[PDB]
């Protein structure tokens, strides 16, 4: 199944934050309406924040997270969770290798903001 694609309410600010846990340099691309809206890059084996940003979901509300290491797409796992029918988390794990810890880049999207 497709992973890392989330439909947000239209024209809504959301946060996107990426953590790295891998020897490989992580490249996280965030697409809105199928166009790159943010890119984070960094390396850490200690959960460092390689990027955090505020974006707008725009007219389509379609947000896609892509993760790659030296150009090779990582395998993604994702889900969305809603607390008290209002607070939203769109969660992404990614695996760049063979150990299947799926933490190599961890991406969290949250809304609403403000």
């Amino acid at each position: 199944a497709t992973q890392g694609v989330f439909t947000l309410p239209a024209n809504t600010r959301f946060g996107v934050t990426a953590f790295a846990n891998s020897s490989g340099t992580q490249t996280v691309n965030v697409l809105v309406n199928n166009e790159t809206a943010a890119t984070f890059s960094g390396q850490s084996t200690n959960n460092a924040v390689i990027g955090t940003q505020v974006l707008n979901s725009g007219s389509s509300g379609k947000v896609q997270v892509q993760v790659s290491v030296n150009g090779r797409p990582s395998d993604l796992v994702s889900a969305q969770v809603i607390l008290t029918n209002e607070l939203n988390f769109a969660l992404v794990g990614s695996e760049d290798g063979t150990d299947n810890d799926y933490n190599d880049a961890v991406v969290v999207i949250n809304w609403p903001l403000g």
Partner: peptide
Amino acid sequence: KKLLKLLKLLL
């Protein structure tokens, strides 16, 4: 750590 790519290159 891309040990499979390292093994491929060395062997």
